[PDB]
A paper describes a structure:
Cytochrome [name] enzymes (CYPs) are heme-containing enzymes that catalyze hydroxylation with a variety of biological molecules. [name] catalyzes the hydroxylation of β-ionone and flavonoids, including naringenin and apigenin, and causes the dehydrogenation of α-ionone.
For further investigation, the three-dimensional structure of [name] was determined at a resolution of 3.2 Å using X-ray crystallography. The overall structure of [name] showed a typical CYP family fold with 13 α-helices (αA–αL, including αK՛), 8 β-strands (β1–β8), and connecting loops. The active site of [name] was located at the bottom of the inside of the funnel-like cavity composed of five loops, including the F/G and B/C loops on top of the heme molecule. The analysis indicated that [name] has two possible pathways. Given that the turn regions of the F/G and B/C loops showed open conformations in the absence of substrates or products, while closed conformations were presented upon a substrate or the product binding of CYPs, such as the CYP105 and CYP101 families, pathway 1 is most likely the substrate access channel for [name] and changes its conformation during enzymatic catalysis. However, in the structure of [name], the corresponding loop remained toward the solvent area, and Tyr93 also protruded outwards. We speculated that small amino acids, such as Ala88 and Ala94, are the points that disturb the formation of the helix and cause different conformations. The bent loop of the B/C loop mentioned earlier generates additional space for the substrate in [name].
Residue numbers in the entry: 9 to 185, 188 to 218, 221 to 409
The structure:
């Protein structure tokens, strides 16, 4: 197989990150296939312009916490997919990353998410009781595709029905359509909503929100640049609307096929909050990438500057080398080491909102629907990429 000289032959697998083999059997089961086999902790693929793939769990944590040799200047695959139009501070490296994260953390820290807790759970309550009487529901189109969106719009703009039609912008950045066309499709997918957020940063540059608190924030005694200010507000809409609607689908479907696990939470309701990150360990969906900065040797192979390394976070929480029996959900597990929210300086700034949205879901779904099941003979349709999409969850009770 055509490949550079510094990569061996036993470390080569044909794997498209946007369409892996066995994706129809499960996004989690498809990516864990590289662990059940006998492959080193680091593997390489010729698809999408060629890039490395970290497979072992403890190696993914080591790459995230090493920004000196793994730069964030390129986070998407293929290599030249997210150029010119860059998101902030996802595509930044320290010490440049430090001041711009303080802007996103100004409104997304724990205290700011906690002051909205009674309002967030109000959405879950008003959304569940609209179908709790009918005994069934299309969970993807009556909650998971509504509850997280309505929460973030209440914090930001309230465009009603016109942003959910535009929420496909995030679908264009994590599942575009040859590396040349992937970049050109992501190019227009990035600028079409880069122009949509432009009339929002200027009309809100005075005062009085969650995006306004970020635009009016200063950096070293001066506001942010239009390219670096539009990229920050655009990143908040991306992860805030796409990386959470997909998590609720694959979790409630798992709980619908495990009548004992849901009974464990109904008996002890305090185990929900105390075991929230156990769901994040079992169900990770993000697969971020990094560009190697300097020539480094990790896992017995040398990585040359300019290459891309993929970090599928699904191979950290589901790694049997770190978590004993990674398939079973142990709410009482002591040390559930995961990388669902990433690691290092690029930690999920909205992990507390994710932890709060999932707790107010389970606490209000089980208080009204204790027993529930998935519709028999049905299942989701899994689509991979930078952020796993997945669709098709139907519940009965
Ligand atoms: C709900 C489940 C979510 C998951 C599983 C998730 C996952 C991730 C992951 C894996 C990263 C690391 C990216 C990288 O290393 O390049 C990340 C970064 C980030 N996420 Fe999320 N995300 C979620 C929701 C959110 C929400 C609701 C927000 C709200 C704005 C958000 C804001 C961010 C930001 C700002 C970063 C970049 C942090 C930095 O550059 O230092 N995320 N997320």
């Amino acid at each position: 197989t055509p490949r550079p000289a510094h990569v061996p032959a036993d470390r080569v697998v044909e794997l498209d990150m946007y369409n892996p083999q066995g994706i129809e059997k499960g996004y989690l089961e498809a990516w864990t296939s590289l662990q059940t086999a006998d492959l080193p902790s680091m593997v390489w693929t010729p698809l999408n312009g060629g890039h490395w793939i970290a497979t072992r769990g403890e190696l993914i944590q080591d790459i995230y916490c090493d920004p000196d040799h793994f730069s964030s200047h390129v986070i998407f695959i293929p290599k030249a997919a997210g150029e010119k139009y860059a998101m902030v501070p996802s595509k930044m490296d320290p010490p440049e990353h430090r001041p711009y994260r303080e802007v996103v953390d100004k409104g997304l820290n724990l205290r700011a998410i906690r002051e909205r807790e009674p309002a967030v759970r109000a959405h879950a309550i008003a959304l569940i009781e609209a179908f709790a009487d009918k005994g069934h529901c299309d969970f993807v189109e009556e909650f998971s595709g509504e509850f997280p969106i309505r929460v973030f719009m209440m914090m930001a703009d309230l465009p009603m029905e016109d942003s959910p039609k535009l929420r496909a912008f995030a679908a264009g950045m994590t599942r575009p359509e040859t590396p040349t066309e992937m970049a050109d499709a992501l190019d227009r997918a990035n600028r079409s909503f880069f122009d949509y957020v432009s009339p929002i940063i200027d009309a809100r540059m005075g005062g009085d929100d969650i995006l306004t608190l970020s635009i009016n924030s200063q950096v070293n005694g001066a506001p942010m640049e239009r390219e670096k200010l539009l990229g920050m507000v655009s990143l908040l809409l991306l992860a805030g609307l796409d990386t959470v609607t997909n998590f609720l689908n694959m979790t409630m479907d798992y709980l619908g096929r495990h009548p004992d696990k849901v009974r464990e939470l109904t008996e002890n309701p305090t185990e929900i909050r105390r075991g929230v990150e156990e769901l994040f360990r079992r169900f990770p969906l993000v697969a971020a990438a990094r560009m190697v900065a300097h020539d480094v040797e990790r896992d017995g192979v040398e990585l040359k500057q300019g290459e891309m390394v993929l970090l599928p976070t699904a191979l950290h929480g589901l790694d049997p080398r770190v978590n004993a029996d990674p398939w079973e959900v142990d709410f009482q597990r002591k040390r559930p080491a995961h990388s669902t929210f990433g690691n290092g300086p690029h930690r999920c700034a909205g992990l507390h909102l994710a932890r709060l949205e999932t707790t107010v879901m389970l606490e209000e779904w089980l208080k009204r629907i204790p027993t529930f099941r998935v519709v028999p003979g049905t299942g989701p349709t899994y689509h991979s990429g930078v952020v796993a999409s997945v669709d098709g969850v139907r519940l009965e009770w």
